[PDB]
Amino acid sequence: SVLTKAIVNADAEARYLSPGELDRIKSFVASGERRLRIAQTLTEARERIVKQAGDQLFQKRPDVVSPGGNAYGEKMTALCLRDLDYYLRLVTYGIVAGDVTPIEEIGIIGVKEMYNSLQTPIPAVAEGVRAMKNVATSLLSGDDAAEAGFYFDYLVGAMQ
Amino acid sequence: SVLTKAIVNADAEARYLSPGELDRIKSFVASGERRLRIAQTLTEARERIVKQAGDQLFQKRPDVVSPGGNAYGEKMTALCLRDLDYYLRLVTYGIVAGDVTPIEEIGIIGVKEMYNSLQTPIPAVAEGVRAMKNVATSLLSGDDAAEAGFYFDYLVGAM
């Protein structure tokens, strides 16, 4: 969260919170109501976002949904969708927090290592998140979409 | 090499070479002529090893050499073969050294980064090395083959 990050830096410096840090907290609390609305929109449309994103991903990459591919088979395909749903949930948590800290601890640290054991291709996963962003952006208002885009972009960047 | 490794451990402990360290040098230098022979065989059959392993690889992974696939196109296919040749040369260096130091510096440290940028799939480069092992091992005597095998396996491990 924004709050957590500010406090943590101050504690390390052993100082009370700076005027600038206080201002950033004020801005975040003002933005909060908007943020909650954006999160709610995505939560409602989640089933649709996952499905549309999945389709795009499978179209872009035949291989994942092929005998060689990891996603091949119904169970495997479901798991690939489940993963996409997990990442969407993370993004919503990020938007309300105002930071990627929630996202990062749950999903980005160790992601390479986890996927490498599974043998899932990381670039494909990134594509799925990109896909999800495109769908999500359409549902959101332009201003809202920009905010949401940053969080989506972070995920895509991290999964690389 | 074996030499370098032994000396480095001694220098760090600020001591002369142990009897054990000396023994390992003795064993290694006795094996030298045999090691050179193994390397020579593989060097001579290089073109065959690469090519036959390449063919098996393309059979094992049709996708890479497909219009969708990364390796698709003749230029791209050549590069994949060139890479296999590079890795084979590295293996021979390892065998004569009796250790991986040469191999490791030239071909494994930073390897994850380079292929990932290129987008070439590493979960398949390892397979190509496995393929090369099978071909190379068939041109060697059983004892020689085992020695050569270790170095091939190391590469597969390192990726």
């Binding site: 092929s66 005998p67 060689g68 591919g69 | 073109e47 090519k51 390449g54 063919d55 393309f58 059979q59 992974r61 049709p62 996708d63 050499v65 497909s66 219009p67 003749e74 230029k75 296919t77 050549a78 590069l79 073969l81 060139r82 040749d85």
Partner: peptide, 26 residues
């Protein structure tokens, strides 16, 4: 130049077509 690779690679592509095999789990 990788000339030897360039001719050998096209020779390999001409002798066999990879675009049908499909991956096998094995």
């Amino acid at each position: 130049s990788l000339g030897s690779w360039l001719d050998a690679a096209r020779d390999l592509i001409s002798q066999n077509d990879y675009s049908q095999k499909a991956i096998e789990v094995e």
